[PDB]
Design a protein around this ligand. Structure first.
Ligand SMILES: [Zn+2]
Ligand SMILES: [Zn+2]
Ligand SMILES: [Zn+2]
Ligand SMILES: [Zn+2]
Lengths: 113, 109, 103, 111
């Protein structure tokens, strides 16, 4: 399973969504982006099941990776990778958390005058 | 398993923690600060495994609820209940997300 | 002006709301609570105008505090104080950010 | 004033920064990381005042946009534009919130 580095930071979260409430576009092929690159999405299924479908590129015809996520489980998605999800039942609902890399700026001994 | 209602709101997320970076007191029997009906914490473990032990009350000798959370899994804990977690390995790391009911986030007159 | 202490941390944000998309209960008298006491709400108006009506207590007949927040401005709401907001137009829309004391 | 469209989504919020705690790079002319159409930063001042300076390009001699932000106010800055900020006082602190269009956060495939 793909893991999010322990030093990554949580930036945003989505409300709980189901087939009807989620933005329609999440069920079609797409890329999850942020302000910066390398954002890791973490989809958690609270009930039912959710399927992740990843592709080689923006136009490949069939998925090159499939992950089934059941209630009580989560899966982090490969960054900058085209994909779409699919709800397995009408009762399925889930939410998504996004994580980004931390910034480490070198500092000096004095303050900036 | 405990499930958090669809209308609940994500209010806070703790950073990733391991045996060393997490608040020492989380491994000791405690009551989540501010816990009350409508406040559900969700613990997801990214690596290793975390064990949750729940107790009927502050001084119960044995727990009445045991949950082993592995990497790729999460568990929602019951509010207003004494408990504690335990990291099963040194490289274990998890984070906790909190969700709360709209009526308690904004209590009307 | 009421200010949020520099050491507080941002915990949550609401999407942009207007008279219709906002949760109804916000236009009615209420209290913002959050998991811990002392939370600070910061309402910023992106367009139109919002008015804050604060009250002495849960049942005061009239408000003891009034603040008009116009586009390009925000206002920090006194914690633990009952209040309700009023959008001044249909075109008005705002969002709320919440800040809490350092963990 | 620039306004962030009502359907945009809050993606990041920086902690409160002052003349010393803010990343040094924000005080010098730069181009925000990942800046592009659909990404608007919103800088609001909690105390003191902050001044934004925008430039036509990277080497323009003079700025062509100036926004003074007092405490209790905020200003949305244009995307893909060279700029820098200046804290008017030592006791000044502020924070920035970034908002992004839904079509940019979730880039739909085309054919
Ligand atoms: Zn996605
Ligand atoms: Zn706990
Ligand atoms: Zn309120
Ligand atoms: Zn900037």
């Amino acid at each position: 399973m793909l893991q999010i580095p322990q030093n990554y930071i949580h930036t945003r979260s989505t409300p709980f969504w189901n087939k009807q409430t989620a933005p329609a576009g999440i069920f079609e092929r797409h890329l999850d982006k942020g302000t910066r690159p390398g954002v890791y999405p973490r989809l958690s299924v609270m009930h039912g099941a959710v399927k992740y479908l990843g592709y080689a590129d923006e136009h490949s015809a069939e998925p090159d990776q499939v992950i089934l996520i059941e209630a009580g489980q989560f899966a982090v998605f490969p960054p900058e990778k085209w994909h779409n999800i699919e709800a397995m039942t009408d009762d399925t609902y889930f939410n998504i958390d996004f994580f980004v890399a931390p910034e480490v700026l070198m500092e000096g001994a004095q303050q900036r005058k």
